């Protein structure tokens, strides 16, 4: 709480860090490594739901325009969920920060690149790409205190 506020001040989105951490029961007691894992779980929750939305979009006769971007975005979310986030969870739980930052750098890039494919058109799940990107950015900054 004291630590939560201070932790969140050292991030590029103070309000998103705080709304995210204060909404999880683990933040009251948790040390900063716990705050890091709470963020990673929030990125994961949004990434899982983007993956679901993409699948639903691709199998329901999608506009020809969305077909490339959705294909590509499906893969980006596969990388976030089965590589980047598990690694960052590995590194916080049993390793060292450094690699968590790598996984948060990755997931932030992948979520933006997915959004970028819709540029010049209407983007079907913008709030979810932006949330994954911004949560990952907050996450990056938290792990970057640890170093």
CSV table of C-alpha atoms in Angstrom, one decimal:
chain,number,residue,atom,x,y,z
A,1,UNK,CA,0.0,0.0,0.0
A,2,UNK,CA,2.8,2.4,1.0
A,3,UNK,CA,5.0,0.2,-1.2
A,4,UNK,CA,2.3,-0.1,-3.8
A,5,UNK,CA,1.9,3.6,-4.3
A,6,UNK,CA,5.7,4.1,-4.4
A,7,UNK,CA,6.2,1.2,-6.7
A,8,UNK,CA,3.5,2.6,-9.1
A,9,UNK,CA,4.9,6.1,-9.1
A,10,UNK,CA,8.0,4.6,-10.7
A,11,UNK,CA,6.0,3.5,-13.8
A,12,UNK,CA,4.7,5.0,-17.1
A,13,UNK,CA,1.1,4.5,-16.0
A,14,UNK,CA,0.6,5.3,-12.3
A,15,UNK,CA,-3.2,4.9,-12.5
A,16,UNK,CA,-3.2,1.6,-14.3
A,17,UNK,CA,-0.5,0.1,-12.0
A,18,UNK,CA,-2.5,1.1,-8.9
A,19,UNK,CA,-6.0,0.0,-10.2
A,20,UNK,CA,-4.5,-3.3,-11.2
A,21,UNK,CA,-2.5,-4.0,-7.9
A,22,UNK,CA,-5.2,-2.6,-5.6
A,23,UNK,CA,-7.8,-4.9,-7.2
A,24,UNK,CA,-5.9,-8.0,-6.2
A,25,UNK,CA,-5.9,-9.4,-2.7
A,26,UNK,CA,-2.2,-10.3,-2.9
A,27,UNK,CA,-1.0,-6.7,-2.9
A,28,UNK,CA,-1.9,-5.8,0.7
A,29,UNK,CA,1.0,-8.0,2.2
A,30,UNK,CA,3.0,-8.9,-0.9
A,31,UNK,CA,6.7,-7.8,-1.4
A,32,UNK,CA,7.6,-6.2,-4.7
A,33,UNK,CA,8.2,-9.5,-6.4
A,34,UNK,CA,4.6,-10.3,-5.6
A,35,UNK,CA,3.4,-7.0,-7.1
A,36,UNK,CA,5.4,-7.9,-10.3
A,37,UNK,CA,3.6,-11.4,-10.5
A,38,UNK,CA,0.2,-9.7,-10.0
A,39,UNK,CA,0.9,-7.4,-13.0
A,40,UNK,CA,2.1,-10.4,-15.1
A,41,UNK,CA,-1.2,-12.2,-14.2
A,42,UNK,CA,-3.1,-9.1,-15.4
A,43,UNK,CA,-1.3,-9.1,-18.8
A,44,UNK,CA,-2.0,-12.8,-19.0
A,45,UNK,CA,-5.7,-12.3,-18.4
A,46,UNK,CA,-6.0,-9.8,-21.2
A,47,UNK,CA,-3.8,-11.7,-23.5
A,48,UNK,CA,-5.9,-14.9,-23.0
A,49,UNK,CA,-9.0,-12.9,-23.8
A,50,UNK,CA,-7.5,-11.4,-27.0
A,51,UNK,CA,-6.5,-14.9,-28.1
A,52,UNK,CA,-10.2,-16.0,-27.6
A,53,UNK,CA,-11.6,-13.0,-29.4
A,54,UNK,CA,-9.2,-13.6,-32.4
A,55,UNK,CA,-10.3,-17.2,-32.7
A,56,UNK,CA,-13.9,-16.2,-32.6
A,57,UNK,CA,-13.2,-13.5,-35.2
A,58,UNK,CA,-11.4,-15.8,-37.6
A,59,UNK,CA,-14.0,-18.6,-37.5
A,60,UNK,CA,-17.1,-16.4,-38.0
A,61,UNK,CA,-16.6,-15.5,-41.6
A,62,UNK,CA,-14.2,-12.5,-41.0
A,63,UNK,CA,-13.9,-9.6,-43.5
A,64,UNK,CA,-11.1,-10.3,-46.0
A,65,UNK,CA,-9.4,-7.2,-44.6
A,66,UNK,CA,-9.0,-8.7,-41.1
A,67,UNK,CA,-7.8,-12.1,-42.2
A,68,UNK,CA,-4.0,-11.2,-42.5
A,69,UNK,CA,-4.0,-9.1,-39.3
A,70,UNK,CA,-5.9,-11.8,-37.3
A,71,UNK,CA,-3.7,-14.6,-38.5
A,72,UNK,CA,-0.6,-12.7,-37.6
A,73,UNK,CA,-2.1,-11.5,-34.2
A,74,UNK,CA,-3.1,-15.1,-33.3
A,75,UNK,CA,0.6,-15.9,-33.5
A,76,UNK,CA,1.8,-12.9,-31.5
A,77,UNK,CA,-0.6,-13.9,-28.7
A,78,UNK,CA,0.8,-17.4,-28.9
A,79,UNK,CA,4.3,-16.0,-28.3
A,80,UNK,CA,3.0,-13.8,-25.4
A,81,UNK,CA,1.2,-16.6,-23.6
A,82,UNK,CA,3.3,-19.7,-24.2
A,83,UNK,CA,6.8,-18.0,-24.2
A,84,UNK,CA,7.2,-14.5,-22.9
A,85,UNK,CA,4.9,-14.6,-19.9
A,86,UNK,CA,5.8,-18.1,-18.7
A,87,UNK,CA,9.5,-17.0,-18.9
A,88,UNK,CA,8.8,-13.9,-16.9
A,89,UNK,CA,6.9,-16.0,-14.3
A,90,UNK,CA,9.8,-18.5,-14.3
A,91,UNK,CA,12.3,-15.6,-13.7
A,92,UNK,CA,10.3,-13.9,-10.9
A,93,UNK,CA,9.5,-17.1,-9.1
A,94,UNK,CA,12.9,-18.9,-9.3
A,95,UNK,CA,15.4,-16.8,-11.4
A,96,UNK,CA,16.4,-13.1,-11.7
A,97,UNK,CA,14.3,-10.1,-12.9
A,98,UNK,CA,16.5,-9.4,-16.0
A,99,UNK,CA,14.6,-12.1,-18.0
A,100,UNK,CA,11.2,-10.9,-16.7
A,101,UNK,CA,12.0,-7.5,-18.2
A,102,UNK,CA,12.8,-9.3,-21.5
A,103,UNK,CA,9.4,-11.1,-21.4
A,104,UNK,CA,7.6,-7.8,-20.6
A,105,UNK,CA,9.6,-6.0,-23.4
A,106,UNK,CA,8.4,-8.8,-25.8
A,107,UNK,CA,4.7,-8.9,-24.9
A,108,UNK,CA,4.5,-5.1,-25.1
A,109,UNK,CA,6.0,-5.2,-28.6
A,110,UNK,CA,3.8,-8.1,-29.8
A,111,UNK,CA,0.6,-6.4,-28.6
A,112,UNK,CA,1.5,-3.2,-30.4
A,113,UNK,CA,2.6,-5.0,-33.6
A,114,UNK,CA,-0.8,-6.7,-33.6
A,115,UNK,CA,-2.6,-3.4,-33.3
A,116,UNK,CA,-0.4,-1.9,-36.0
A,117,UNK,CA,-1.7,-4.5,-38.6
A,118,UNK,CA,-5.1,-2.8,-38.4
A,119,UNK,CA,-3.7,0.7,-39.0
A,120,UNK,CA,-5.6,2.3,-41.9
A,121,UNK,CA,-8.8,0.4,-40.9
A,122,UNK,CA,-11.0,-0.2,-37.9
A,123,UNK,CA,-9.2,-2.3,-35.3
A,124,UNK,CA,-11.6,-5.0,-33.7
A,125,UNK,CA,-10.1,-5.3,-30.2
A,126,UNK,CA,-8.1,-2.2,-29.6
A,127,UNK,CA,-8.7,-1.9,-25.8
A,128,UNK,CA,-7.2,-5.4,-25.4
A,129,UNK,CA,-4.1,-4.8,-27.5
A,130,UNK,CA,-3.5,-1.4,-25.6
A,131,UNK,CA,-4.1,-3.0,-22.2
A,132,UNK,CA,-1.6,-5.8,-22.9
A,133,UNK,CA,0.9,-3.2,-24.1
A,134,UNK,CA,0.4,-0.8,-21.2
A,135,UNK,CA,0.3,-3.5,-18.5
A,136,UNK,CA,3.5,-4.9,-19.9
A,137,UNK,CA,5.0,-1.5,-19.8
A,138,UNK,CA,4.1,-1.0,-16.1
A,139,UNK,CA,5.4,-4.5,-15.5
A,140,UNK,CA,8.8,-3.7,-17.2
A,141,UNK,CA,9.2,-0.7,-14.9
A,142,UNK,CA,8.5,-2.7,-11.8
A,143,UNK,CA,11.0,-5.4,-12.6
A,144,UNK,CA,13.4,-2.6,-13.5
A,145,UNK,CA,13.4,-1.5,-9.8
A,146,UNK,CA,14.7,-4.9,-8.8
A,147,UNK,CA,17.9,-4.9,-10.9
